Design a protein around this ligand. Structure first.
Ligand code: 57Z
Ligand code: 57Z
Lengths: 600, 601
């Protein structure tokens, strides 16, 4: 499905984020039978969108709810819309959403972190008010991405269990909008930017227009047109270019025009001219070895859950700018597109990841599970199909973002059973055909080591999650150092791939200080991080370090029973722990994007 | 002036809350001279609106900045807006704002918590993009509401000093919006709803139209038309009505139409049919004695400052619904209008207050160069009074139709001991009564200006007493405080025979601090401190309200934080409950709704 992000000019957007919506629980699952979308929601209350519904109400019974919830709101179509193509779009409805315009079912979606839209022109009269009803479901099963399993007790009460660390927040987490286009419109764009030794060259264009003739022009930051092209595709611009570089992120504007006999459509696409490639043990941006610094993150904050917020990304970005982070990873689900836009504009490198986390029954944090992970009753052929679909929707959404340099199709799957490689090999090869321009990865769980892991050879970059090393090493630092280094070297011998440690750190209660440098203390977090740093600087194959996590986040419970939820460098209200200043000195102390010399 | 809150009707709005604006500091104050609005802001950064600019960037040098900041943003004007009147509106720009469309200066405003808008039709071309630049100033002087004084040191670096407890957050704190109307449009509406022993009547209106004929229709919640009328202002409608009551807040819809016969304009106004009146020592809503419970609040949250936010509004209301608060006060400044909208719909009682706080030089928290005469040319003067009156004007005209607002508070804790005091406030008190006779009026009293020394309280209808800091003067002793408090309350009862609301009480409490000794800063002491007030309240007939200070921990100025008083909340800043939250809940849900406990408690 083609998706382009809405921008304004021959097109227009009316944001429906005006938060307050009618909101209801459907504890008896009678909402569909009684067609709640036909009238006003009964016994509803005010809720804010975007935002998770879970923490908005200080109510535990709502927070831990599993099943269907209902959103509802009336909105006016502008008068001036008539004659235009009118689209209703949800940037994200977490897990499942079904939408009604008045009484007409218009769209449906499974997948909680990517947009979905439908042409609603025949069901609205511009200038009138229309009722919009959304049925949102938060249940996970073996075919959802991520997977989980629902447990219904004797009384028929549902309770959600799952296998990832973060809390299962749900609701309309991101922007809802109506947007307009001419009946002739640009429906899809794909751009590839080749570079050759940085004095030269090119921007390849493939464009799909639902119904028009295509012209294309490229302007710089000064708006000087620097190249032009004709045709639905084949376009191969010619440039002596300002390259999209980490830390700067120069952007061109690719204006795409689509001409009918009577109508024209103009679409501006931000373009960053840069190359990404793996060469041996190195990751190359613009044919230069890059060293990642930064975080695994989460979409998590007080009150709003995974709900999107402008003040929050402004603040968070000022923080990882200050600390010297040049990169991050969209940990365990696709993020709101605004972060990617931010990264594009500010030259921030991003590892884009699917919501495929929890394909693992051996994590061991917890208290009726299938014994075969890859089997009909668990991860099956439909799961693989859902997994592939999740990869499609992520790539189709983010293929043009210069900030995205790699695709992560999963996080910490158990790769020890035999059916593992049969599951992932097709996904890995489908991913390469959906987007050949970017290296591919699958984030490795630690107990699936170099000796036991079966799938990593299918990918381009080795991303290692090392977080719970403090558990297995019982907190001993010098056993941890020698164990860490020999495992990293073993991975370097098995694969000869560039290595990024995408998770490392330890749970740290802010304000706990110790003279013994022991667990949960701020001092231990510093010493624990510092040992990873010393080892990284002695291993040539390591090209990246991303700390887990940026800030304390709410966890499943689940993880909170080990407690469990203090993994951040910052607190949830974004206050720095002492380790924040340790990272700042290391990350601002090195030459930008340059691995430190052997060793340090 | 003419302010009506935008609704979609014949009128359309494009929110400019698409938060990311261009943002820059102006430390050399060259922005106006180099005419920054003509081009794109140089060396700017992304900022979010609505929101304070202070805490968005983790930067102290930006947080403590005093002077001009610049906002800038490009936006497309809708295609179907051609032929329409196009207005550019800011719900609030905190303290001062000046706005440019492209190169055309279109508006200017002083006052940080009330809307201002301008017809920009001749300066925009529909279907094209226009550059919008806002110069925002956060400086306070003796003529601003609230007042303060700016100090320029050795090096010429500005530094802001002021007299209120909360931090001087600034920026575009609330919604920005372009909206449209037909060239014939409803420009103002005023509604007064009379009630008489609650079985019947009445609704008087007044509508100002720039240029059209007026029809008026009133529909109930079922959308049944229940009354109609004609004329620009003649309506005095007749109903056997469902009255707006605390805890429910039934609302009617008054549809106002303005007709040319090439153009028509329709405006829906929510109307709550209720009466508010003082009679002796009682506060009457719909001729029924009402008892206030709840909080003094603040517009304060992590990261965003005083920036407005829907999730936070939903959560806080879930909390003070749960806790049994039936009311609150817009402490020390006008709040965003959405809150009043919430209160109207949910039947929540509100004391609406101006930003006139800090008219006092004797509070004594902080370290130094202050005028000796509070009411004089060098301090609070005649121009200050004019700004003060202007602030009252803008508040009332914005909130005159909100049924949740049951009284106006024109000031908070002014020093009334100096010589110019009664001369300053008496005109303001009477000007306000002329602006809206329908609502009782008040001025929140500082404790040191007691019954013997206060000179202005007789000029008002309801006595609002701030008793926070009782713990300070009483050295934390509970039963001396209990004895002092009861007598001061009785002293006020004999001097004035006004109904008494305690609008501030509580004590600074470090969340998570527990003590076997029930000492200061501990949660156990806070519960014990609050309870002593409750016992005294239940012994005084004149007390008709208790509002705790404060709802949640909020950021304070350095002076207050040097004594470290930013822990005044019942809840923390991230909205976690202290043990007192559960004490108030049991008391407030335990009493009959809106009913003062019987004598004894
Ligand atoms: C903090 C903690 C607590 C408990 C109760 C655990 N039990 C386990 O089986 C395991 C298994 N294990 C050790 C490998 O030999 C790991 S590293 N489990 C793991 C858990 C969550 C992840 O995201 C990754 C790995 C770890 C563990 C950790
Ligand atoms: C917690 C605290 C701390 C300090 C350093 C003080 N100095 C005072 O002179 C005063 C003056 N005072 C006692 C005479 O009744 C009061 S009540 N001052 C006051 C301060 C702020 C207000 O919002 C209200 C009153 C109080 C005070 C309180």
């Amino acid at each position: 499905s083609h998706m382009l992000r809405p921008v304004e000019t021959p097109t227009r957007e009316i944001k429906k984020l005006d938060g307050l919506w009618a909101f209801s629980l459907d504890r008896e699952n009678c909402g569909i039978d009684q067609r709640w979308w036909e009238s006003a929601l009964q016994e509803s209350r005010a809720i804010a969108v975007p935002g998770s519904f879970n923490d908005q109400f200080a109510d535990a019974d709502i927070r831990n709810y599993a099943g269907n919830v209902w959103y509802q709101r009336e909105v006016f179509i502008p008068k001036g819309w008539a004659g235009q193509r009118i689209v209703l779009r949800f940037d994200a409805v977490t897990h499942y959403g079904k939408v009604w315009v008045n009484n007409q079912e218009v769209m449906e979606h499974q997948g909680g972190y990517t947009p979905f839209e439908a042409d609603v022109t025949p069901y609205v009269i511009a200038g009138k008010s229309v009722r919009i009803t959304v049925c949102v479901n938060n249940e996970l099963n073996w075919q959802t991405i991520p997977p989980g399993m629902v447990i219904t007790d004797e009384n028929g009460k549902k309770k959600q269990s799952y296998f990832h660390d973060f809390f299962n927040y749900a609701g309309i987490h991101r922007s809802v909008m109506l947007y307009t286009t001419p009946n002739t419109w640009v429906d899809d764009i794909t751009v590839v930017t080749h570079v050759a030794q940085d004095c030269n060259h090119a921007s390849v264009d493939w464009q799909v227009v639902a119904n028009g003739d295509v012209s294309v022009e490229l302007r710089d930051a000064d708006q000087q047109v620097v190249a032009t092209g004709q045709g639905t595709s084949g376009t191969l611009q010619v440039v002596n270019p300002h390259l999209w570089q980490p830390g700067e992120g120069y952007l061109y504007e690719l204006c795409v025009t689509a001409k009918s006999q009577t109508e024209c459509d103009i679409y501006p696409l931000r373009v960053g001219i840069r190359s990404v490639a793996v060469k041996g043990e190195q990751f190359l941006i613009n044919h230069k070895p890059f060293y990642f610094t930064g975080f695994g993150r989460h979409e998590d904050a007080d009150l709003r859950g995974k709900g999107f917020d402008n003040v929050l990304m402004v603040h968070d970005h000022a923080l990882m700018d200050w600390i010297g982070a040049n990169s991050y990873r969209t940990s365990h689900y696709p993020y709101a597109e605004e972060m990617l836009d931010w990264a594009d504009e500010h030259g921030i490198v991003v590892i884009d990841e699917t919501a495929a986390v929890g394909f693992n029954l051996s994590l061991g944090i917890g208290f009726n599970k299938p014994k075969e992970l890859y089997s009909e009753e668990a991860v099956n052929g439909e799961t693989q199909q859902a997994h592939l679909q999740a990869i499609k929707e992520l790539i189709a959404r983010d293929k043009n973002h210069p900030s995205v340099v790699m695709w992560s199709i999963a996080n910490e799957p158990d790769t020890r059973p035999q059916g593992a490689r049969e599951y992932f090999a097709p996904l890995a090869e489908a991913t390469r055909k959906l987007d050949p321009t970017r290296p591919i990865t699958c984030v490795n769980v630690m107990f699936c080591d170099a000796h036991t892991d079966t799938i990593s050879d299918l990918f381009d970059v080795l991303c290692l999650n090392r977080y719970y090393g403090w558990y297995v090493q019982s907190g001993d630092l010098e056993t941890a150092e020698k164990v860490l280094e020999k495992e990293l070297l073993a991975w370097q011998e098995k694969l000869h791939q560039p290595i990024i440690i995408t998770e490392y750190g330890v749970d740290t209660l802010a304000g706990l200080h110790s003279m013994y440098t022991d667990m949960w203390s701020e001092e231990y977090q510093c010493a624990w991080l510092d040992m990873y740093h010393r080892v990284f600087d002695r291993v040539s194959a390591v090209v990246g370090e991303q700390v887990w996590n940026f800030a304390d986040f709410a966890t499943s419970q689940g993880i909170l029973r080990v407690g469990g939820n203090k993994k951040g460098i910052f607190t949830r209200d974004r206050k720095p722990k002492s380790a924040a200043f340790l990272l700042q000195k290391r990350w601002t102390g090195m030459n930008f994007g340059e691995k430190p010399q052997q060793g340090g």
